[model samples]
Target: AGHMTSILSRNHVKVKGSGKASIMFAPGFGCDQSVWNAVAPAFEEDHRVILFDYVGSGHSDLRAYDLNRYQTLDGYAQDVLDVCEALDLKETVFVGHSVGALIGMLASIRRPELFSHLVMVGPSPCYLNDPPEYYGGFEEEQLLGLLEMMEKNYIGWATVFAATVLNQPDRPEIKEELESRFCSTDPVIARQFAKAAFFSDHREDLSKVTVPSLILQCADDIIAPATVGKYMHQHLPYSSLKQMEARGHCPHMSHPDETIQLIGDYLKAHV
Candidate 1:
């Protein structure tokens, strides 16, 4: 009882709506649960919606972050399992974005009954290119340089990443907002989170998933790329891939209406 209470506070869990069915949201690296601001609310009227932050991100208890434990994304996956266990959730809808998607999948694979449906937005199972076998959109040196730059550049790298690559070039303000959001996170933790996100390879873990899943792939995602989505769809069991008309990695922020519609449509049609 006390353990669940601590988990709830540790993750800064927030629950909305009072519906019988549950829907939990997980955000990517350098981001908090508020990333779902535009999307998560749509389901609130019908389903019990849960939102929380990872230990080192958002309002989560930073003191709880352990370097050794969080060296891998599996530690982040535990946060998801903890939230589910704390809320006594079963057969809930699990939604995640970017790196958050993999975290949710890892959790679902470990505890299938905890989630009934998996909705991954702009997800990449791995961020590195594994020559002859897979193309995850980045080379080892490129990713390593990225991590180094992340640690070295600090705010500059976050600004450059958001301004130059991650978001749409046309909307300068969104990227500004993005970088500003990343600015809110501690640079040291952000760097480690970037390492955990960029170096993470979950291709082998895909086959272990048993829940019905949906992949909301953006058309021009520089980070995940179209190929990564194809790879995830191919390997993840019982999964459906929907190529979004959205042009950037963050569909929820840039194209919230379409993103919302697509997710709603998928759940209505399949789950």
Candidate 2:
């Protein structure tokens, strides 16, 4: 028990409720466990709600971070598996945002028995366009330009990038919150994570996921647009796509009540 507690502590894993079922929330790159603040509580009453930061994010032990291990999304997936193994979690409903969703899918494919359902909020298998075949919305050079901007001026990059991706210009607070989260991450770690996330090509992995999945797509998200969601739905087996009324990549933050309701409805029918 002490050993398990230590592992949980290392990852800043917080557990709530005593229900037999469990739900794990995974935040995206440039984000921490706190990103789920608005949504996680909704499941606490009827489920074992679990929230934790990726090794390099939030209050997680940064000493454990290894750049080599996190060079790919698979490494992030392993982090998810490690958390589940430590907690002895089974039949977990994984709710992941942005890149976190891809991490969850990779983890689910690796250990199908551990997961019951997957909820992907603004997920994208590939962020770079593979033209004539796939439309991931960005070119390699464009991504490089963004990376260069991040390297030169992290704060400016955060401000503009956050606002662009959030797409909620009307809600200044939403953009501010996202900018804060981006700026909070270690610049080195954030850069590496961003490279891995944006450069990754997980199109092949989508069909490998056998678990029932739900794709919560935002209507006007600049990051993972409607087309990306549609592509994922078409590729992922046993998946359902639901278009959200909200704009922005972080609907759980921008439209928590609606996001919660959509997730609740799905769980009621499937979980």
Candidate 3:
């Protein structure tokens, strides 16, 4: 059994277990550790499950958030490193969603030994459009408009968007599940997160990652299209791309059992 404790840093990482191979989870922008509610329980019996919100999100220390410090994905990556060092975690499996996946990729490049493997769900290296033929996901104007929508009705926008993204032709019930997870986010930090996730780009450093990686792509994710995941898999040296049958971006939240099983199976085979 493990106890809950808070780190002293500005973000104040919240840890939930003391088991071996502490699995570190970084939530996507605009959300917090609560996003792992369903999946966390699955791993509690076998491994230490560590989860936390970045500064300015959820229960993290809000006063520590500096816009200038977090203008790039690098800033968030540093926070991830700091948490691992603070916990004295020698080896970890990083599980990230959306923006969290981008941060995980960047961090693995910096400290390859710290991460045993990465399970990136709904990952994208760049959120803005790229030239020639590639689709990096959103266009500049569309991203800008989304930020505006976040500024106008932060909570409503988060709820609706999470629901809308899950309403694919296949998985119909995903909308309600996504909406529930989205509603748990802190409105104030969610607004700031929209800027960080949509604006930051780490496409240039994709080739630097040396650790074993797994890119879990949603077959029907509108936000992180299959193309981007394929591009990421192509760039990473030791990586495998698994396309899930889900339609939403947050499959771990929308389809917890299946997602967790997929990750567990990958770890068993790869590690």
Candidate 4:
């Protein structure tokens, strides 16, 4: 238990329930483990729930963060692998949101033995459009402009970006909560992670994932559209795509009941 304690503390890992099956939850860029609070607890009654923040996000050991290592998505993938190794988890169910979904996919590709099922919420392999073939939702210059805006006025960028991503103009509180969460992260770390998330091209890796996967795509998501989810489903050998009714990037937060239902149903049928 001491070793487990040490490992858990390093990444601020939290565990819930006493079920035999384990579920590891990973949040996306500008998010911490707390982002899963709305959905993770639903699984606690029947499955062991694991939640942890990435080094630059929540209560993780910031001292362990290295700029060079985290300049690419591989560094984030390593963190996911390290947590799995620490917990000695095998055939665990991994649920990842947004960029975290890609991180989980990378880990599953590298070590298929570690996962039984993968649930990807608003997952995208690439964010930059590849023209004549793929439409990843943004152009190179547009993303660069976003980054420059973020660099100049992080708070202003966070306010607009959070609201835009959430897409819930009726519920101001949701956007407010998301904005606050975005502001909580260090601007430098947030900018770096944004670059990693948007600038990355993992289309080739999608076909390499052998684990049974579920793609939960939201309706009209600005970050990850339904087209991206369908693209992933078409590419991945063992994957199912479900178009969610929720209208935002973070469905787990916007529509927890539906998100929980989709994930639970997928687990029952696959895992």
Candidate 4 ranges with C-alpha deviation above 4 Å: 1-6, 58-61
Candidate 4 residue 195 Cα shift, in angstroms, is 0.5
Judged by whole-model lDDT over C-alpha atoms, candidate 3 comes out at: 0.77
Predicted candidate 4 versus true structure: per-residue lDDT over 220-253, tens digit per residue: 8998877889899999999888999999999989
Using alpha carbons, what is the TM-score of model 3? 0.86
Query: Candidate 3: misplaced stretches above 4 Å?
Result: 1-12, 16-19, 168-189
Please list the residue runs of candidate 2 whose C-alpha ends up more than 4 Å from where it truly belongs after superposition. 1-3, 58-60
RMSD of 4: 1.7
* lDDT to native, each model: 0.85, 0.89, 0.77, 0.89
TM per candidate comes to 0.95, 0.96, 0.86, 0.96
Give the Cα error of residue 3 in candidate 4, in Å: 7.3
Q: What does candidate 1's lDDT look like per residue over 1-271, in tens digits? A: 4898888888889999867677888887777878789889999998889999987764556877888877788898998898888887757888898998899999888899888899999999888888787998888999888778888777788887776445577798778888988888877778777888888888989999998989999987889899999999999879899999998888888889998899889878864
TM-score-best of 1 and 4: 4
Report the backbone clash tally of model 2: 0
Candidate 3 lDDT over 1-271, as tens digits, reads: 1212334355556667656677888887656677788887677676788886777654555666766767667788888887887778898999998889888888888898999988898888887778665688788998888778778876677666866566554664656555555566556556666777777777777778888888999977878889999988898888898989876787876778878888889877864
| Worst lDDT 10-window in candidate 3 | 1-10
